[PDB]
Amino acid sequence: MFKNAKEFVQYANKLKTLREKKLNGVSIYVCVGTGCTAKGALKVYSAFEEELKKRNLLKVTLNRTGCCGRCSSGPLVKIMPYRFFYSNVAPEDVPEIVDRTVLKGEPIERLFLTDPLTGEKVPRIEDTTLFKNQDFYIMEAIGESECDSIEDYIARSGYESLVKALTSMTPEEIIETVKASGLRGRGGGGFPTGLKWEFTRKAQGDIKFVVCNGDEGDPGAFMNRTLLERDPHLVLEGMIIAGYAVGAQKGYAYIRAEYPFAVKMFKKAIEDARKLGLLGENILGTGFSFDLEVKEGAGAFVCGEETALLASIEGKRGMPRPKPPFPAQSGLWGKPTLINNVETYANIPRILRDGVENYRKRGTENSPGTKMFSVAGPLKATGIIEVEFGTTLRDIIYNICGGFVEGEEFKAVQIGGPSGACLSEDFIDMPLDYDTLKKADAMVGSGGIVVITKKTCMVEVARFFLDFTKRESCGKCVPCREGTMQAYNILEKFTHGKATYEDLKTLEHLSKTIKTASLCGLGKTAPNPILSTLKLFREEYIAHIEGECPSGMCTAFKKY
Amino acid sequence: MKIYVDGREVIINDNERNLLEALKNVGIEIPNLCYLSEASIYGACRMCLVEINGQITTSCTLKPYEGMKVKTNTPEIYEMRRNILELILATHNRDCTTCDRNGSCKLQKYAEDFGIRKIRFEALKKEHVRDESAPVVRDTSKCILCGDCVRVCEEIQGVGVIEFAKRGFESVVTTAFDTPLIETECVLCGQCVAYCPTGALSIRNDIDKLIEALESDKIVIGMIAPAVRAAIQEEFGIDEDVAMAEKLVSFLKTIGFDKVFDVSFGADLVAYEEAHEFYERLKKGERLPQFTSCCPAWVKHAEHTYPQYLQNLSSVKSPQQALGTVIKKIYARKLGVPEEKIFLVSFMPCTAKKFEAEREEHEGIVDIVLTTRELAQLIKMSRIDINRVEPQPFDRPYGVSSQAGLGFGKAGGVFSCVLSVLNEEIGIEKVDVKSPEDGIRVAEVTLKDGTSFKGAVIYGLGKVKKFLEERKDVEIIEVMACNYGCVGGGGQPYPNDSRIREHRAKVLRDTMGIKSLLTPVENLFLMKLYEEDLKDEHTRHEILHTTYRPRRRYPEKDVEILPVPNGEKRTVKVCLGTSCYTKGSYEILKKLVDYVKENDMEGKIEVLGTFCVENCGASPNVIVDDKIIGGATFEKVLEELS
Amino acid sequence: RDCTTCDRNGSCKLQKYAEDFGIRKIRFEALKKEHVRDESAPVVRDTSKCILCGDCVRVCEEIQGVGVIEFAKRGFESVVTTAFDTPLIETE
Amino acid sequence: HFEKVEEILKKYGYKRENLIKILLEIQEIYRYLPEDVINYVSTAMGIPPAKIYGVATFYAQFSLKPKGKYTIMVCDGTACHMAGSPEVLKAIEEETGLTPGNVTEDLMFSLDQVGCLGACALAPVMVINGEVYGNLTADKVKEILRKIKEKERESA
Ligand SMILES: Cc1cc2nc3c(=O)[nH]c(=O)nc-3n(C[C@H](O)[C@H](O)[C@H](O)COP(=O)(O)O)c2cc1C
Ligand code: SF4
Ligand code: SF4
Ligand code: SF4
Ligand code: SF4
Ligand code: SF4
Ligand code: SF4
Ligand code: FES
Ligand code: FES
Ligand code: FES
Ligand code: FES
Ligand SMILES: [Zn+2]
């Protein structure tokens, strides 16, 4: 598969045969994605290894899989020949699993997935109500895909789209199909990616760059890292296709150093692709050269800004600059640079494999495709989910996540982190879109979701988001640098029950200044929580000015 | 191009970069705190907001286009601009009476114009830095984070010792690890101060020492730099004035100076000595190329950056030190007064001269160095119209100087003086001068006998690196740390941009033109000095020559846990590296800390933390009295402590 | 010494002299004075900026004939104020 | 006489574009960024120390003080914050007497608040040397802190 494409086709066909062989046999997949490892997934994998080794009955095979969308349901394990999904698998009952299931095959009722809605246990996750209520287009082979295996990715039809683009199509047709599909920037802005690819390609320059923004753009979201740990080769293929479309010969992946597993997975995927010839000085013997590097993010929320990201890659402080000249013309080292989110690159190969009409079959007329989210807060089922671009907040909160834990009630929801919006129940029945809710003071955002309950003081929510923004400000321009800290001071006064209507007026007027006069998007959206809470929860601020706090958590006055 | 500003037809210009600059060229001013000096950029103040098509945006980042309707003043823009200014003023150290920019501060003028009379925001506290260890004084509580000093130090001076650090509310311009500026590689050129728009960067004022000296019984002797007379007139807002130095002499004598001399005499003496030294070097073809040592900033820069070229530096000391040493060692004897009785005051345009006067090799010669601004303050205190002061000549025998000596005040002065000395000693057939770049000039000189050399004049530190890396065909190189030479020194009147520096150079050239004697030998007093006092080479070497030593940071900066400020101790250091941390070291540190907690009542034991000592693979390491142990532990360090 | 929020900023003789005399520090410690700040009336009072020149007292008495402000106390605590530090809006 | 630092610099070829990665490696080796180490790095790379200091103090992963023997990481993400992370921070302070970004006298404990750790189902979440303890409260945090204190104190 290093000279022509027919060798790659034969390699993929035989890899598919081998994968079918292994799948038909008894195999074990333990979800080693973030959250499951926090619950002890790695110790479960060690227990499986030792038990399966001492018994020495390996034709069993043990594999590591990515997130399966049920992070809250303990470490996740499933067996293939009988697709029985096991949850809350402790390292102590692994021998029981091996004896009862791997050897014999008797379903284990005690170790299955409960149904939050119907209050019953279903043996298969694919039969769970939550699984059916979702829309899996990007995440595929849930629980049965090897995260650290280019062989598995190829055996699941992976890398076919890149070969189709290289051998058959020419960059112009690739960019045209991306434009026609209507794919929009998943990074949060929603800008049509096809137009961005046109901008980068048309830029006058022989050398160009492709940059992947791995940042979550939110301190309460884990979509991009989960996708990277699920199918790193999907993002790798998308980046290669983008580099071919815009005529680049070098691409950079920006993954935080705080995420060791994502960095390891992407590095291993890159090395495997290079070894198999997908990356190198001559890909599939077509005269196209391209290489990829992973750049470690030392940790700075401001590095999600395009200019700050470019400065960070080049080894400087992540300081943004006035956007024009745009990165599409002069980005990395003054050369054209295509910058997109992880989910955008993941979508690219899916669009290429499918068509334009087939892709648009999911979503809305202006927002085709799917969006992966990370729902959090107190709910029966939390984790990574994917939904169509027409779903409402009620569907996600109740039908997909199972609703709230007993003794809890809905108050509000955060949809895009600090830069996002705070939505009350009056917007719950509004289909998600980059246009439908972009006018009602709301935005889908990078994909983070956190539900707020009645026992949450929203003045404190605004204080928390402003404290985060005050910490993350790069300190370049006066509005963000100074006003964020001043607004945090005012909000802290509100929390400590020593605020006044003068402080409320000052905060309201300073929010406009911060939003309008700030240089980059960090400061522009810095007062979004303040504006949202004051537009939706003014009575709580007023009660705080009176030392009441109807929620009653923030301890500033009690037992007097 | 035609544009509509506030509803009226306005013609801006054909090609322009942004709306703000175009309107400024027209004559329409938009308030902003970005254009503050020649090293300024746009985008940080955010105060230039204009309204176009409904949305507000900064005019500095807005490319103008034909027939654009722009409203530069709307109630929303007033609100936003006042909010931004109040934000700046909330955390600003608002003490203008003791500020060095008082009366010439844009922020102060805006606070006046914007009618800010109370701070609506909280004057929140910051981890401010107050560095006063060097003639350049840092006070980050007055910093507006414009970044002009960073650009000046990096791009213009080529040192890069000050940079932005941290982020957010804690953003600060400072040296690495908050190291005192005196201890860094700073050359003290003072250009950052010259470009600073606030009082954050300032010059150390030493007027109190001068006043207490004048009030004492010591004989105060003043000597004025050539470039001080070419720029002092700016502080009083009057036109250029030749004879400035002589009315300065009159004023200084009025306020109690016993003698006032001219540093141009020292410049002539230095040029003579350096010309002879360079001729010897040429005839021997050794220690070449030669570097002038008249700029202390360049000398310190070489000590920090070119330890291999320290032998190429001219042994002759700078005019200030040469003239001061001559005074203290010869004039005192001629007057029959002990050297302790004479108080020597130097009036310079340079902040690095303050450092030079305090150098170990120059100890006790120059008592105090006062910059041009401090001299202007002295004049302004008296409230006498200096323009009306009748000039009187400098004092003998160090009062007269040649035109070449006075030429030292601007770039190329010392090279021209050396050329004149050589020409008089041995004629010069011709000189061909080239200009490879803006601040670099190269001269090819042929002597009458036939031996020829090449000399380069470089003003503006930071251009030296490329020239030294690529050009190796010169024998003498003049280096001036400041652009345009000393007319643009750190201590010169503010503002200190290029137009004023060129005007100062023109003023100094006009002052030079009215000098009769043209070369140092024509200076009778200098020849008398050589014939009577500097007759022999030993005295001349001890008087006019100095030695230079390399500079290298000596940072120990070990982690402090239970330090002892002073006194004999044990200074036990525990390695905190990963390899050492992998087994024991942290446990050993805890045990030792608890031991000194129960024992070690006094400061006998000093428990320190240290980074990897390059002894990994030999078990945890514990340094004791700067000694290596290996396989260290609590008992193994206790036994050594015994 | 807070000239930024002062109404005489730019037209203060004391500010100009501080600029001219090169007073960049004070070795005299900032003693604490019982300063009087008033905001009750359109005429605002702030004795922390007062140099006790007495011009206001003469203006009010000799010129305007009201004499509502006068020198009180003595020594370091010398202050120009209203009777019993009464707010200006409540005086004559 | 620096050897490992020289190895890292040579591996990345004294290129400023790799300065952040070089600093990450140096921290991983020395556990922090000593002034001497990055002074040597500046000398080797021909980059002024102020530049490296500006870069180091801008990103969170870089620490200028040694990391504690038991480095504590308390998630401050949205879910963990509404779940009670401030209570966890207050308990940590009252027990060990420190605030995020600080270290104890003997370098036994250090604290840093970070973003989502990807375990929102366990909010609030704390990490100590890779050991994650979820569903935490003031009592639980104090109890575990005492237990680890005694365990380390044993030494043996
Ligand atoms: C403070 C801030 C953080 C951001 N974080 C992210 C991020 O984590 N991921 C992302 O894709 N975009 C992020 N963005 C948006 C990108 O900087 C920018 O929109 C980029 O062009 C994304 O390209 P895309 O729309 O194709 O995804 C952030 C923007 C700001 C102002
Ligand atoms: S808005 Fe904030 S993050 Fe953006 S450039 Fe200004 S200070 Fe930096
Ligand atoms: S820089 Fe000095 S003069 Fe200007 S506002 Fe600040 S304290 Fe006043
Ligand atoms: S005095 Fe010169 S070398 Fe020192 S910090 Fe200022 S500009 Fe840099
Ligand atoms: S020290 Fe002066 S020049 Fe430097 S950033 Fe601060 S205000 Fe600007
Ligand atoms: S060029 Fe002149 S003013 Fe500048 S540092 Fe050198 S001697 Fe001083
Ligand atoms: S005495 Fe009166 S006029 Fe004089 S400074 Fe004080 S308040 Fe002003
Ligand atoms: S990480 Fe395992 S289900 Fe999400
Ligand atoms: S002039 Fe300062 S941001 Fe425009
Ligand atoms: S880690 Fe201690 S000697 Fe290197
Ligand atoms: S918000 Fe803390 S782990 Fe997700
Ligand atoms: Zn409250």
Numbering used by the authors:
A (entry chain b): 1 to 58, 70 to 571
B (entry chain a): 1 to 642
C (entry chain A): 94 to 185
D (entry chain c): 4 to 159
Q: What does the literature reporting this entry say, word for word?
A:
It uses electrons from the one-electron carrier ferredoxin (E°′ ≈ −450 mV Schut and Adams, 2009), which is reduced during pyruvate metabolism, and the two-electron carrier NADH (E°′ ≈ −20 mV; Schut and Adams, 2009), produced during glucose metabolism, to reduce protons to hydrogen (E°′ ≈ −420 mV; Schut and Adams, 2009). The electron-bifurcating [FeFe] hydrogenase from Thermotoga maritima (HydABC) requires both NADH and ferredoxin to reduce protons generating hydrogen. Electron bifurcation is a fundamental energy conservation mechanism in nature in which two electrons from an intermediate-potential electron donor are split so that one is sent along a high-potential pathway to a high-potential acceptor and the other is sent along a low-potential pathway to a low-potential acceptor.
To investigate the blurred regions, symmetry expansion followed by classification was explored to separate the different conformations into classes. Initial attempts to use D2 symmetry, to match the core, resulted in maps no better than before, however, using C2 symmetry revealed two classes with bridging density between the HydB lobes with local resolution similar to the lobes formed from HydA and HydB. This bridging density breaks the rotational symmetry between the protomers in the Hyd(ABC)2 unit, explaining why D2 symmetry expansion was ineffective. The two classes correspond to the bridge domain being formed between different HydB lobes: when rotated by 180°, the bridges are identical. Despite extensive attempts, we were unable to find a class with both bridges in the closed conformation. The observation that both bridges cannot close simultaneously suggests that these behave as reciprocating elements. Thus, unless the HydA and HydB bridge domains undergo substantial conformational changes, the FeS clusters A5, B3, and B4 cannot participate in electronic exchange with the rest of the enzyme. Fourier shell correlation (FSC) curves showing the resolution of (A, B) the ‘bridge closed’ maps, both reaching a resolution of 2.8 Å and (C), the ‘bridge open’ map, reaching a resolution of 2.7 Å (although note that the bridge is much less well resolved than the core in this particular map).
